[PDB]
Amino acid sequence: IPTLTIAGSDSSGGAGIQADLKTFSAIGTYGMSVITAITAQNTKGVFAVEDLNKKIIKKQIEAVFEDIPPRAVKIGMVSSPEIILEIVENLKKYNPKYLVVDPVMIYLLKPEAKENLIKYLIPLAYIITPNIPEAEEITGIKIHNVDDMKRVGEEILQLGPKFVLMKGGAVDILVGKNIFKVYKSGCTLSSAITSYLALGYEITEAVNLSKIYITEA
Amino acid sequence: KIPTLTIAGSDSSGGAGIQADLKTFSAIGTYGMSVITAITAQNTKGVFAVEDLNKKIIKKQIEAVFEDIPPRAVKIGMVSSPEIILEIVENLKKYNPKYLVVDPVMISKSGYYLLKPEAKENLIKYLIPLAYIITPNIPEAEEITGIKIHNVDDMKRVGEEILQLGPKFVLMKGGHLDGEAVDILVGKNIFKVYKSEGCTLSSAITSYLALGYEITEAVNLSKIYITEAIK
């Protein structure tokens, strides 16, 4: 059961494709990756961030989808607006069943990248997993309490995602058309959801298990 | 939370390189980190693109990892650029990790060289001598020493020649010979024979060393891991 992560590389192993692959491995899906950028960083700071060229990113995408296609795909932090479009164009070509978009912005974000994320990537998401500042950047609405989290979440549903998991911080909320759930509370969570959706779990359930998974880790 | 580092190329299909290493690390229980040296677009049907990263971003990745909470064991996987091999060696001498597991990937199961002459020369002359343990197949052991291997006695003698070059231990993987397949562990004062079976074996050895097992038990547990993985 293949699950793909499309994100940057983090040398510390705390985020990016490393964190996603570790999670896929622990949960039991077969991990695959398209690396979009290389970052040298640790708990003390970022030493360097370097985008990969678009043709090597394209080749990675073709290699993954054209052999054993992934059941579910996670998109993490992609800072290049051009790389975001490249990702969108190819996702529409292969149409993986479940797309999990984690709009990572931490503060590192380009206005044009924000624009592409919102206009083109988000509407394709089965589920989007923004934290509070990401939900604010996306909608331009302040978030003060859970009522504002719920409401901003419903504003985000209007952009196309089938579900929104808003991460507070302290509670998280899952909103969908006929679904509202509160969870007493990052990259691990969205990769964990990707794996459970790929394994055939229903969305509320996949989120249940992902939280439980995090506790142990 | 025991950190283990892998320094190797990325394989999009997730069957090799850092992806395979990170999967093993995670399954065994160590905290995986990686210095990526190259980007490869490939799958079971073939290799579509390979791109070496620049020296500077490799250097920065290494510095980042060693300047915070460093790894308790380090695996070096396949590195195809001669220049990157030298930079990895210079950085490894600066940080001096205790458990350096070098998987000297040079020749495939199918019998093809996987590195050009200069890369191979740099790996053999400068990286291999820093290893705590190396995990060559028979063709690789032959390549390292220039000595032909026809049986297990030869495996042992060539393993011992390899120790004089710097590694404290050699785990020579069998399978290549026409005869009986066995894996042999050789150190200055140990010789042990194991059942024969890759990336998983070297990455699993890295994890068990980091977890606090001495080499012989680390190898032992790695083999049990593989057996359990195969089912």
Describe the model.
The structure is a homodimer. Chain A has 217 residues and is an alpha/beta fold. Chain A has a single domain (1-217), classed as Ribokinase (UDP-N-acetylmuramoyl-L-alanine:D-glutamate ligase). Chain A has eight helices and nine strands. The first copy, chain A, has helices spanning 16-27, 54-65, 81-94, 111-121, 132-139, 146-157, 187-198, 203-216; strands spanning 2-10, 30-42, 45-51, 72-75, 98-101, 127-128, 163-167, 171-176, 179-184. A nine-stranded mixed sheet of chain A has the order 3-2-1-4-5-6-7-8-9. In chain A, strand 8 (171-176) and strand 9 (179-184) form a beta hairpin. In chain A, helix 5 packs across helix 6 and helix 7 (187-198) packs across helix 8. The longest helix of chain A has 14 residues, at 81-94. The first copy, chain A, starts with a strand and ends with a helix. The interface between A and B is large, with 37 and 37 residues. Chain A: It catalyses: 4-amino-2-methyl-5-(phosphooxymethyl)pyrimidine + ATP = 4-amino-2-methyl-5-(diphosphooxymethyl)pyrimidine + ADP; 4-amino-5-hydroxymethyl-2-methylpyrimidine + ATP = 4-amino-2-methyl-5-(phosphooxymethyl)pyrimidine + ADP + H(+). Chain A: Keywords: ATP-binding, Kinase, Nucleotide-binding, Thiamine biosynthesis, Transferase. Chain A: Pfam families: Phos_pyr_kin.
